[PDB]
Amino acid sequence: RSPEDLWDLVDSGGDAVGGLPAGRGWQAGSALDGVNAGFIHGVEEFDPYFFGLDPVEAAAMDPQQRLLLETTWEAFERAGIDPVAARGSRTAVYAGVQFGGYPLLMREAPPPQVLDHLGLGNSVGAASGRLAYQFGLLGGAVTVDTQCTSSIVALHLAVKALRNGECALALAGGACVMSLPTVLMDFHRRSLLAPDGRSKSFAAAADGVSLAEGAGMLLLERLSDARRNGHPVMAVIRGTAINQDGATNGIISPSGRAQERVIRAALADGRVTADSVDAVEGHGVGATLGDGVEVTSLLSTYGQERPAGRPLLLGSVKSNIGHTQTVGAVAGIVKLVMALRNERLPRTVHVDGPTPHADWSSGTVRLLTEPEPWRRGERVRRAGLTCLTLSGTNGHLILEEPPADEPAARPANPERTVPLVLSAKSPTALREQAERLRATITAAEPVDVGHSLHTTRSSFRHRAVVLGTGREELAAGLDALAGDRTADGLVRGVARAQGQTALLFGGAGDGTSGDRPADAEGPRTARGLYEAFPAFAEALDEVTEHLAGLLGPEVRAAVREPGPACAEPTVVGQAVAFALNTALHRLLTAFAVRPDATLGHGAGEVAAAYAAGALSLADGAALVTALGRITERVATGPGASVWVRATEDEVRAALSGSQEQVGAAVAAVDEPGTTVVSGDAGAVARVAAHWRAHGRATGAPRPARLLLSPDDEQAALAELRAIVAGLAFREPEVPLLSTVTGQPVEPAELRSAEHWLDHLRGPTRFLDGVRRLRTDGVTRLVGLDLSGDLTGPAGRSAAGFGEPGRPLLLASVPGGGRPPGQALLSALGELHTDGVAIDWSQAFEGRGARRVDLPTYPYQKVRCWLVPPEPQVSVVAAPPHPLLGTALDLVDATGQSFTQQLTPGQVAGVFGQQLYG
């Protein structure tokens, strides 16, 4: 199922020819008794749902179309190209295929549904069309037939298309499946098969040919374009030719001369010289005469020009796998490509001695009777294919090494976290990938595996992310995924296509609510992000070094080493909170998280407005520092605040109806079960006592949260109007909601010095803001929880909204995970899992990451065939005596009777006497 599987077979010196396939519906009697051939087992099994095919059309498709379709996906995956990125490309397709007769299996007329799919399911020219349709490719898409040479002809045409600049990529190969037995019956009837079914390539033991199946596709590009795109190169195809035996007197060999011409034509096309070739993967099909003619034509070309001490090395993979018919040239390429990578030439099996039908006596050519080393070095390694056919279209290719595989010059690093990302089209295929991948992570570099997975593979509907630092942690996470058992290192889920996402920005001071063990640890965690994510470090300094000048360099120390002041209502705290909010927003957008709305609480509204694009970064810091100084006057003022476990309408009614309320008012309305009250410390404390007398809980006391006098208002309006008039406002990219209104912000409101003071002339209405995000379609909701635990009141106000039992995802980005990066990567992993198209590159940026090979997709195959599998073959019995015919069973008959019909061609066979003509 891969080049490495072929290499393991070939390099171990095995063979793959065996007994006939069961489970194909073959009616064949004794006519194949004792025949051996190289079959693909399970060719009748396919995964229609992976390709989006209806299973009745997948039953109608010729197995050759199915193998091309399946093999093409795998070719893109090993090129390291996402097939979704190939859609709309100028990729051309060239497929060698022959009509296999698959519809002729049917014992009875087809059902009316499958009948309408048999046409495009079985046309030869439809095969390349179906590939280019499925993969959305725009180049030419042609099928070719020349019997055995069809694959080498497809490669030649693809090389000539790429050199002529028709297309950016070309995709070339073929398929061959014996869906019907008839070709085996014919080659057996005419005694062409070797009696044991082995193609004894070039051996004195040569006996005959041996049939086999196969499919293969190569993805091809001009070497200069491949290199500047940074693609992998497995080998170089350097030059190609086709010719024809034609016809002649037959005292000269047409094939002998024609093979000598095609070799010289291919060498000239490649602009190489015959002395520079090391090996030939010859045809060597095992016919007694043909193997002698081929070796003769090599002796008269390559065998005349050898360097001193360098015989041409000859072999053939057809000895390991049989003939393979239309794909013979692909099998030869896959062997040579793996031989180049492993730096060895494999043995040829079943050689008893070199065939007597050629003069080996020159010593300039020898069979690979034992494997030989083929190290990279000063002499550039090169090899040739031949492929031949009785209808006379010959071909030859020259292959060459890849360019030098230059190392990364790889740096040392601490073990920062790696996010492995997996996805599949169904849950079982997800767990299959976890098993396949575990055999790789236990050997390859974890950062290189992680960096490969997010870019060289497509993203499907069922998703998982595995986080860790050590190879053992990643292996433990993958094992838990494979076992379908939950572990904290991983995240699981299914992509909702709905994009609708919103982002929540906090002010500094709300950590006064008392959860300072979290609201100081959030900022300490945000310090940890500077070490792990370059986009954060740049963004933070682009606030800090730009705008610390408004406060003096003391704020730079507070930003670099955050502490309790970062959770407190102060100019420094407000500035630090704005800096860290800005840095996180620039980090999340570097991960390609895009908000469809923003909401900001208190002074966090400036950050939410900045993130909505409504301001420059400089305007933000100017406004934040003004609101910072106003906040100092309020927080240092004579008043107080409390929270009460009573809702707005309860508190407002009890407050307004009673006395002992003097100057106490509702400051915030953020979650259904509690509200915050502020004003005179006397009235505020007495309102709290009143609610404890009603048996409610209260949190108390705290500093003031509102303007305590119109004196403070007039001072603040004088300070704001001067500054607000100077800010370079512009209209937002995405809807910005305000906690002043609980509503979207208009152009004039954005520009209003009154509006910016209304954060201090409250209440704050965060509950209404979050409730509006959900009416307006927001499915997933992200907290910049550096202070006030802002996602908590968001969850408690969001979840009770209304009837439909909707999806709701709450994510906290500077979260509680112990290594600081794992909290952020876990939150991103959860968004990516739910369906956000996150760009993982920030986890791998600034590290020694290299692309490496990975397993390919695990199809979940099921039987797709026009007929049920046969019963046990014991059913068969002798034919009727030719003119006695079939015995009837008319039920009440007193003695048996029989009938025969003789058609005209049978009549002349049975009536063996003529009288008078």
Added chain:
Amino acid sequence: VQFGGYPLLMREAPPPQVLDHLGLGNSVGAASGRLAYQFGLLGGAVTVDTQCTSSIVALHLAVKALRNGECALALAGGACVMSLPTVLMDFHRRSLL
């Protein structure tokens, strides 16, 4: 060229002297092979299929072969014969005609 299904006209089995010629008589790859055999031509011989465009595709490749200098002349075209009625029956059944 496209596979026409011609041998499927038979009701009886063929005589063996016909049977031995049905393979090369009906293989689509053999169609271009016969021409280069009969006329003794030495250039590459290719049979192509792309449904209705099969001829213009064959002609396009022949123009490229001549421009590349692969050959002295090129000989390009195609054929289509309804040896069986089944394609008319499909287009009539689906009311495409």
Added chain:
Amino acid sequence: INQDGATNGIISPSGRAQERVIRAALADGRVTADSVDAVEGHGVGATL
């Protein structure tokens, strides 16, 4: 030659592909579209 590929029918995939192949054939021949007098179209008789 080109394929019309596969996408939403609303943007006329065959229509766009036909416009591309015409421009490519002109660009291969080095001719310009004003210098063509007539075209022998497909015109198979299918209504759309």
Added chain:
Amino acid sequence: TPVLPAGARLEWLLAAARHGSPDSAWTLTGIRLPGTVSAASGTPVALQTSREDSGDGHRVRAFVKGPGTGGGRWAERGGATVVPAVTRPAPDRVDPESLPEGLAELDVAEVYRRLWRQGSDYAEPLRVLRRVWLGGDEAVALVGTADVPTGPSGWSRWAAVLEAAVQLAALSGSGPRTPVSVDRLEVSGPPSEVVWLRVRHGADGAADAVVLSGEGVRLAAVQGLRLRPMAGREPAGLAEAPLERHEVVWHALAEDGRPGAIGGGTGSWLVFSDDPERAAAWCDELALFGVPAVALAGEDAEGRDGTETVPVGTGDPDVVGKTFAELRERGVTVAGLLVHDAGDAREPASGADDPLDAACRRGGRTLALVRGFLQEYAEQTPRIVLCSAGAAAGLAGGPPHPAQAPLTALFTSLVWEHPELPCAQVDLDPAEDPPTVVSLLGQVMRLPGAGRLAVRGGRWFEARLERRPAPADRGERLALRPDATYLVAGGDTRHAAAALEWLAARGARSVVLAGAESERGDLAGARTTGHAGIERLEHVAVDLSSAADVARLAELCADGRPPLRGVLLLPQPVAGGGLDELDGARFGAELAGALRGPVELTRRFTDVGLTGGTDFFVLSTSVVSLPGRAGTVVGSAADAFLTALARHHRQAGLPVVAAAWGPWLESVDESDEAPAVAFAEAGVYPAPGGEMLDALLPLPAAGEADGSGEAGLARVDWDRYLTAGHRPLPYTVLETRASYDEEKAPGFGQNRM
């Protein structure tokens, strides 16, 4: 299973009869249609027919013959006497519009549903009724364009038109039935594109019919059509479904296990618990989230958070109804009810160890609650959540507690008796802290309709009923060890005789009939069939409700006989009863009466160590109790309790098993088949007790030490089971949870769209 339609057989005889002639008018008489022509899906069929001319003028005799069964021989499947050239006039232009005048119209969709509740379904070419009217002992119909090949012109349309007459002849009846004979059939020409049928049941057990053209011309007539002599022929031998093992398997919600939102202002939540602090704390959590709620507890506890005190502990629904009626008089609107059970905490709270009485207490209380509340506000379509703890098999948290079992029975009773109400069972771990109430109601409100959910650790599971093959050949290889006694207990004589026959057929040398009838009834027939292989047979006449008579069974096997190695408590009948018809006192009495027998035996045999020395100890239950069924509350409760009790001993390492079987074929009464007819329409088919015992008994050596869940063994078609009864909203035990976010392209080759 596919069958040849009776109208097609009746046409097949006519097609043979008219073959030799151009004539357009025909008569067939003395018609017979014995047996049913059928073919298991994917099998060839050979057909033969003969015109065995008697030489008596008109009298050609026609026969039709179906093939041998396997290597068997041809069999008659119809026969008729022909009379050509009918040569007599008939009435003309009989107004078709006069036919419906006395009669009420029916929807054709309900007509084909009525026939589906007679086991019969039809392909589109036989769904040829277009309008139907019915009244008293007759029916009439309009038949559509019956467009058979050679039917719009040609006679083959008679197959469909005659099958429509059979559809109407069956429609007036009850119980599954099929034609047997026709006394006369008379025909003239092929049928028109429209025809009118009249069918009349005026004769004793037989129907007559007329077919008219759209103009009212006589096209055909039928006399003496009979179906009754093949009403209720055995559906068990006809049904396509094999014997299989059915299991309630818990699947983790690994994908998509995020709770989502809660319904907000659309009502309020009633929260009842055994613990007033739990109901209070969950009302607090709902209040934090802005969801209005009320805390309730039984009158056994104080108003510890101003909680409503409910007269539960009285078995009566009506005082409970009056208690909620006061809440409706406050103006309360209910979104749903949450009932929370204490789990095993009743054991330290009471100091008792009485699992059957604990089940009787729980069920009695919870019925009074649920009925009393449904009687008051079911019109609001309230959601119901029944929160058990430690009820679930097949999961972590140790063995299930059998005293929980009334809750699963009560849940499935709501699923089938009030299918308009969305509801769920949640099973908690009994010893871990319960999850946040928002996690419960969120995860529940993912479900339209109904389902069973369980929580262990932070992880959510959903139950699915799923099915796998059952190797009966293990029972062919099971030789019962010869140096041993086996018990057959508690069954009626029909089950006992079949079990005894299976024991003899498996080499059992010593047996005791531990039945109540066993040493008092005429069991000489049972002794006779037993002694076809049983060397030693003995009988007890045991009352299984008596600890003393159960102690007599424990004195046996200790009495020096060949030592005990198998025990089988056979199936038993249990009284019918829904949620309606029932109250908590009645439930406690009936459940105690149902369970005491098998409980006291299993207990006593385990206390004296005859259990575990025994290789195979089996308790009977119904497969129907896995998804449950309407009107069988106590039977479901008993089956659930024995399932949990069996697992409690199995997790203690003992070879005790509860078998959840289909109906035994030998237990189908020949006198009145109606119980088996009801099962057959519901897609449950009887099977031989010996084949089920063969598929079951050797298996306990395989372990399956947790992951088996609730398990059973029967012939069932769950698609019939689900579509029988009635249910608008999905039920995730039987059915896939939901659709999900994907859609499909127009595909290759399409110039369209």
